[PDB]
Design a protein around this ligand. Sequence first.
Ligand SMILES: O=P([O-])(O)O[C@H]1O[C@H](COP(=O)(O)O)[C@@H](O)[C@H](O)[C@H]1O
Ligand SMILES: [Mn+2]
Ligand SMILES: [Mn+2]
Ligand SMILES: [Mn+2]
Length: 391
Amino acid sequence: NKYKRIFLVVMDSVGIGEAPDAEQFGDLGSDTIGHIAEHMNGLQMPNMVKLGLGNIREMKGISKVEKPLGYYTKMQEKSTGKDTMTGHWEIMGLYIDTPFQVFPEGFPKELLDELEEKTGRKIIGNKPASGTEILDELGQEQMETGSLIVYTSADSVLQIAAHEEVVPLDELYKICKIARELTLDEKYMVGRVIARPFVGEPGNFTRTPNRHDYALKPFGRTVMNELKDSDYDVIAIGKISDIYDGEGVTESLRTKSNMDGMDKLVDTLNMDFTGLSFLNLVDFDALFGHRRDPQGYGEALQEYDARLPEVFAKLKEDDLLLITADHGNDPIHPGTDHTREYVPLLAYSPSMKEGGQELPLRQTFADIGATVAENFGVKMPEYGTSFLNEL
Ligand SMILES: O=P([O-])(O)O[C@H]1O[C@H](COP(=O)(O)O)[C@@H](O)[C@H](O)[C@H]1O
Ligand SMILES: [Mn+2]
Ligand SMILES: [Mn+2]
Ligand SMILES: [Mn+2]
């Protein structure tokens, strides 16, 4: 093998400008990093600059360098969707024709009626809301009627909330399994069905740790699947394991923030393993992208960049670092959904003694999976062109 360990970092939603097909998604003028850089009056990311982020595209405070540490380019998404599942599944060697849906006006009547008819329970709510806001509004009604609080977020989820003393956990889990079967439908395909049990009284409701997720498996066997079957290590950090529904994962590390995510990346650098370490930094998307907060987004990027020098110091000669994104989420853009954007790609190894160069534009996210697969000599994915030999 050329590289013993590959460390892949997904900076979630950190796009680098509108894709060629952005108009179809209503995403013209979208530019995640660029608008953040403009808002911040110059983004302070000297370590990403040294890798060659500005060499991909120059933005305010992000300039190009003569000798970048590693190789640089951007990737174009080939799959139909701009959601998290689609992005991550493509990265690992798949092509997804059927996009996952978001529901800013609530779920369609047809789906809710069929869920009512199958469960024998009424449905209240049907709108985007946080866990705290929806329980204060409809929690008391739920307790008194025995109905189900169905709600969503800015992402592709269907959440069902019910009181543990009123609706038993096992009954709530069975309802979510039915909801999962009904949402395996093109008209209303959700990425994740989430059980949201809660306890307490009107005025003081609290969500219990009895939360259960019901996700879909990737539409095809991934490079992660092939690595695991060939006895390689596949360490998932953050929400990576959940996104792939555990497929191809040998070990999973839970994180609570971006800084905690970088701590667990440092933990894997200290581990004697052979294979892939896979990190997702979710804060960019969940906290700032969807909430349209360019200031908080900007600060988070600067906080992330300041952690990189320690990562550079720990990388060995046979280690490869890959930094990318799964889609865009422009914090200065209409609505609450993601943006169809190019994603940056940086590939760095300390063994690159004379630095890196420009790679050809990656026509699919699957080029990463193809590179990972060729490196470890496992079955090549159906989609993607490896850039291993260019490095
Ligand atoms: O808790 P996570 O990170 O798994 O987040 C989970 O629930 C969130 C709701 O947030 P809230 O609690 O404010 O309603 C969703 O947006 C997200 O898709 C889901 O993975
Ligand atoms: Mn848009
Ligand atoms: Mn994402
Ligand atoms: Mn999102």
